[PDB]
Design a protein around this ligand. Structure first.
Ligand SMILES: O=[N+]([O-])c1ccc(S(=O)(=O)N(Cc2ccccc2)[C@H]2CNC[C@@H]2N(Cc2ccccc2)S(=O)(=O)c2cccc([N+](=O)[O-])c2)cc1
Lengths: 116, 116
């Protein structure tokens, strides 16, 4: 589908996220061309899985306690599409409720940005 | 043009920005569909130049200090189209000097996100 760009209406999508730590979950995620890596809420991971340490830069400066890093690949499926997007590693938001589809996933699904 | 999406290569673009407080300048801006409002470097604005205090959400939570708000509209020109993008107001990065094209500007040039 063609998704219009609107400052008042964020470009969201419903995507099934398989973290391979629990059961695959359909969540609402922001489509983000500014993001390099995909951000997945920590609420989808099991309580006993190890996550790597890292630091990420953003608006309110950088941080090292806000984001973590997956130990296992994350599979992401789109609404009617059936083959999953395979991300070797992706960011994990441990504080807020953040689901962000980055360019890493937007590449495998042939996603592009068009300017008339 | 059709801008491809790649995690290893940011969707940057050259744009001419007029802050109406000084000489119009050329910057390299990041095409960001996740940004509600456009962010321009404070290095564009003259030294005086009243700017408003504002609060912005991003990476390391919310920030009371990083971003300011323009008092006057911001003229933005792109390589292709001859007519300029007119934003009523946009964000100003004081800490760093990021150039980020949000959906506010992408709407006025009718930019869309295409997912096959
Ligand atoms: O207009 N806004 O509300 C608005 C909000 C937020 C921003 S923003 O944080 O600077 N800034 C821009 C930006 C771009 C590149 C690098 C850092 C920041 C945001 C906007 N999109 C990228 C970035 N981040 C996500 C996000 C999206 C919407 C709202 C808040 C935060 S981020 O940082 O979590 C995610 C962030 C950064 C990097 C990665 N990653 O995978 O590498 C993922 C700008 C404008």
């Amino acid at each position: 589908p063609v998704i219009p760009l609107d400052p008042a209406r964020r470009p969201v999508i419903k995507a099934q996220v398989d973290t391979q730590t629990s059961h695959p979950k359909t969540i609402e995620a922001l489509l983000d061309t500014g993001a390099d890596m995909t951000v997945i809420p920590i609420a989808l991971f099991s309580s006993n899985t190890p996550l790597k340490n890292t630091s990420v830069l953003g608006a309110g400066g950088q941080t090292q306690d806000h984001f973590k890093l997956t130990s296992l690949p994350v599979l992401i499926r789109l609404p009617f599409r059936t083959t999953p997007i395979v991300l070797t590693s992706c960011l994990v938001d441990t504080k807020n409720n953040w689901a962000i589809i980055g360019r890493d996933a937007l590449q495998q699904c042939q996603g592009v940005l068009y300017l008339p």
